[PDB]
Amino acid sequence: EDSKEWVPVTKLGRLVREGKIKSLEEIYLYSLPIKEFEIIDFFLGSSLKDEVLKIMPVQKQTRAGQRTRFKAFVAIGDNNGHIGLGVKCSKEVATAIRGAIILAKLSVVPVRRGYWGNKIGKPHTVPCKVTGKCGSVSVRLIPAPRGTGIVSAPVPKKLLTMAGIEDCYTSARGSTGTLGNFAKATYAAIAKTYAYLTPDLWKEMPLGSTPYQAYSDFLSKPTPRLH
Amino acid sequence: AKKRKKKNYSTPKKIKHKRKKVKLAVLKYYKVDENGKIHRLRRECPGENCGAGVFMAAHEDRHYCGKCNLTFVFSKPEEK
RNA sequence: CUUCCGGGAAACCAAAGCUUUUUGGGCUCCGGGGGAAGUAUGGUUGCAAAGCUGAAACUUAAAGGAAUUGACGGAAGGGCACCACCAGGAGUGGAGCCUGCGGCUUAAUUUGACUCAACACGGGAAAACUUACCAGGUCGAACAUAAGUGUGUAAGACAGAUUGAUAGCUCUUUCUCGAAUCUAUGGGUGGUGGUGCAUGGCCGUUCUUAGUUCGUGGAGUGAUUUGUCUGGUUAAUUCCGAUAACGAAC
RNA sequence: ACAAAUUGCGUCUAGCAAUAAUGAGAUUGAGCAAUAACAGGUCUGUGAUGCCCUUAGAUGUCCUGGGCUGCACGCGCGCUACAAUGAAAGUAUCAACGUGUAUUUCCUAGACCGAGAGGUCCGGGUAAACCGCUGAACCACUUUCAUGCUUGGGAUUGUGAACUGAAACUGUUCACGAUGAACUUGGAAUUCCCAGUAAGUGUGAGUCAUUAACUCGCAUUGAUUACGUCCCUGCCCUUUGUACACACC
């Protein structure tokens, strides 16, 4: 049970429901604005499982006398190469925990895995040294050889295992006990793994396809075509 | 035994007995003259309202039937 | 002044940026939580008032950094009712009396409720009853256990005490339907007992106003903001119109 | 008024204008009321109720009683007046919401008696039907009073006469004829309110066997003045400094 057959808001999800896009990288070339979560559940859902981080409370001050609101850090992610982060306020927990997790599907990033010192056999950890600085939280990523697991704080290990890394020397400076920027910066730290020029990438490209033009025929028709 | 804020240990000692039983044995007292006349100790009620099975009291000059203890006062009141 | 498209925790910044990648253009002082304390102790300098100089035992889990929100809490700007006036009116607060309640006192003077929103209220205009108060009385209510045996386990009246009356409630003394075997024992029963700082339910105020709050976004590291307006007009977030989710919902 | 309501259109948008009607310049007042809440109110409304208290010697429960009403004192809510726009006498002659007995004695009329209070007899009415067309008070109309704490004002207190209820004694209320205080407009203060309203002046209803001076509406009589302002105590969210926090207590 779905229970609802997904409707496309935009023509991008119309293209994937027509089956003319079968690649998660196809949006990832031109950074296509994915503002429906159903496409994330179109390609994935297999090996895309979630873990809550906190359920930490806040308060809104009123005329009389308080207002209590909830806030839950959470992280879904494909077990090899993807992760998502997000959070959302709510006046009840069950309104949050079934709703705040939708946002991280808009924050799914391809995680690039790299070698450390030898070019044999399915690169594992990280391309290069990447830091994520966000709000007094500077998680510096340092590549590691085999055996040595993901060393981190006790908290962000559940993010990185559900991203796909195995081996990394990693820390940060500051008050990680103020968790709010901590998990967020790692989401910006791991996202920068495709923002680093590599001499492996010095040959470029066939320079583009733009599937708007490659699939305008289905765009041009006004008929609600199934399949 | 209550719990009140002011009055504790009223004590009128509450001596109201249930039944003394220092008297009034049930009628084992019975004499039968032999062959065959029956003598009825606590001779019965002359009132016809009962079946004369009340064992009317032996008392001072005020006797009474047993089915109702206050009434049937033996004075005797004559009616005319 | 503009916007990072830089940097910061932020306001702010063209350098406070290039101190990012666990980073590097040179050189000097100078800080490591408070308060002890810019105090003592000596030197040094001043004609002096005083300065270059500067600690410690003790004591303390926080002192503050910007920002969001509560103040259309005598603080700015704009708009409303005689729970606010003015223009008044009738009043009460004086008198008499009736009741609210305290205080007083009483065997007991049952008691709830202290601003506005406890105070002719608990409809509370009660002889008793109510009544929860005080003083005399008064009822009996489970069960297996259990032991008389039904030679009366009880239950009722006269009679004179006791009584307020008759209360055989008690009892001097008498007959009596006797059986729920009237049990010491499980424990349940009841209460206008306690606690509104255990609550529920209900109600009052917040409310003669005009406000609340959700799914999309761009604000931002987050708090939460935007929506919900600069104005016009409205009893009105009532509409227009700017129109920065609208289709929002009361 | 069912509003093209005519009106040198205001930021084209909602130009007050009463004015057009001629039941009608709203016929027109309440009820319903959110969001987050507060240690508001109540366990004595309840066989809603946790916990605690008790259970033949009860707080429970029914009887006899008392007391809640007790009074040098503080206070609030209202009525009675402080009289000449009257107190007296009569006379004229006006409502309305309502109201009322079946298994409990209500509403009453009619004759009758009684200073009265009340008492007796025959009725009606389960009610647009009888009470009742409820033929309400204050006013209005000739007088009596001469302003004199006065025939204004009726507290106090005797007395019998009532009557309700088994039962009355800071009291059941009501009668008659005695008794006539305090008080002549009320210190600082402070209440409500803009039209059929305030206020005067009443009736019904509610608690009820009898006890209204309150309470819920009814009805009559019918103002001054406001038709605003943001000072003052208020209050509603826009900028705003803050050490503001359990929010200037």
From Swiss-Prot, chain A:
An example GO biological process term is:
translation
| The keyword tRNA processing appears for this protein | no
Q: Does the keyword Cytoplasm apply?
A: no
Entry-annotated residues carrying Phosphoserine: S23
Instruction: List, alphabetically, the PROSITE patterns matched.
Output: RIBOSOMAL_S5, S5_DSRBD
Output the InterPro entries linked to this UniProt entry.
Ribosomal_Su5_D2-typ_SF (IPR020568), Ribosomal_uS5 (IPR000851), Ribosomal_uS5_C (IPR005324), Ribosomal_uS5_euk/arc (IPR005711), Ribosomal_uS5_N (IPR013810), Ribosomal_uS5_N_CS (IPR018192), Ribsml_uS5_D2-typ_fold_subgr (IPR014721)
Q: Which UniProt keywords apply?
A: Developmental protein, Differentiation, Oogenesis, Phosphoprotein, Ribonucleoprotein, Ribosomal protein
Q: Where is the S5 DRBM domain?
A: 48-111
User: Can you list the GO cellular component terms from the UniProt entry?
Assistant: cytoplasm; cytosolic ribosome; cytosolic small ribosomal subunit; nucleolus
SUPFAM superfamilies membership: dsRNA-binding domain-like, Ribosomal protein S5 domain 2-like
GO terms for molecular function, please?
RNA binding; structural constituent of ribosome
Described function: Component of the ribosome, a large ribonucleoprotein complex responsible for the synthesis of proteins in the cell. The small ribosomal subunit (SSU) binds messenger RNAs (mRNAs) and translates the encoded message by selecting cognate aminoacyl-transfer RNA (tRNA) molecules. The large subunit (LSU) contains the ribosomal catalytic site termed the peptidyl transferase center (PTC), which catalyzes the formation of peptide bonds, thereby polymerizing the amino acids delivered by tRNAs into a polypeptide chain.
Could you say which protein family the record assigns here?
Belongs to the universal ribosomal protein uS5 family.
Task: Write the protein's name.
Answer: Small ribosomal subunit protein uS5
Species in which this protein is naturally found: Drosophila melanogaster (Fruit fly)
Gene label: RpS2
UniProtKB/Swiss-Prot annotation, chain B:
Top-level taxon in the UniProt lineage: Eukaryota
Zinc fingers (C4-type) span which residues?
A: 45-68
Intracellular or extracellular location(s)? Nucleus, Nucleolus
Complex formation: Part of the 40S ribosomal subunit. Part of the small subunit (SSU) processome, composed of more than 70 proteins and the RNA chaperone small nucleolar RNA (snoRNA) U3.
User: What is the documented function of this protein?
Assistant: Component of the 40S subunit of the ribosome. Part of the small subunit (SSU) processome, first precursor of the small eukaryotic ribosomal subunit. During the assembly of the SSU processome in the nucleolus, many ribosome biogenesis factors, an RNA chaperone and ribosomal proteins associate with the nascent pre-rRNA and work in concert to generate RNA folding, modifications, rearrangements and cleavage as well as targeted degradation of pre-ribosomal RNA by the RNA exosome.
Q: What is this protein called?
A: Small ribosomal subunit protein eS31
Q: What species does this protein belong to?
A: Drosophila melanogaster
Question: In terms of the whole protein, what range is present?
Answer: 77 to 156 of 156
